[PDB]
Amino acid sequence: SCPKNWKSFSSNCYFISTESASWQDSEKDCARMEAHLLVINTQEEQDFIFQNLQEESAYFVGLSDPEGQRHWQWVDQTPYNESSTFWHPREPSDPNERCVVLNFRKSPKRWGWNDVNCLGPQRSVCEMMK
Ligand SMILES: [Ca+2]
Ligand SMILES: [Ca+2]
């Protein structure tokens, strides 16, 4: 049911970016395709998308702290559940890193979340509801 070049999971469709852009330009691009940036709700959704990423690249996610107050918000305005997050050790790390990416670290090997700069172009993941 999903369009061309979109992975399928549950009742949604997910696009794994190859081009890089800023966080807002990435959300605008997901909106052009009638979607939003990735909003991770269940661990089954999280492990599915880790499986489909370049381990050597970071991927933008619809979680941001626009004020720097460490008040993380999903773009679909669903509640942020602190205890069920996938942060790497020591992250979040910088109040000026206000945008969340998925990235694979090498020692020890782990998939997780990391806060990075928002203007610095990265890859992205769009979530489209079907
Ligand atoms: Ca989701
Ligand atoms: Ca960081």
Quick one: which of 130, 128, 129, 125 has its CA closest to 51? 125
The DSSP string of 111-129 is EEEEEE-SSS-BEEEEEEE
Residue 34: exposure state from Cβ atoms within 10 A (0-12, 13-18, ≥19): exposed
What is the Å distance from ligand 2's center to 55 Cα? 17
Distance from C-alpha of 68 to C-alpha of 74, rounded to nearest angstrom: 15
Spell out which residues have Cβ within 5 A of ligand 1, the ion. 39, 41
What ligand has the least distance to the C-alpha of 117? 2
Which CATH number is 1-130 given? 3.10.100.10
Distance from C-alpha of 105 to C-alpha of 47, rounded to nearest angstrom: 15
Query: Domain residue spans in the chain?
Result: 1-130
Q: Experimental method used, please?
A: X-ray
Cα–Cα distances in angstroms (integers) from residue 116 to residues 11, 72, 88, 128, in the given order: 30, 13, 13, 24
Known binding-site residue numbers for Ca(2+)? 39, 41, 45, 91, 93, 97, 114-115, 127
What is the Å distance from ligand 1's center to 8 Cα? 12
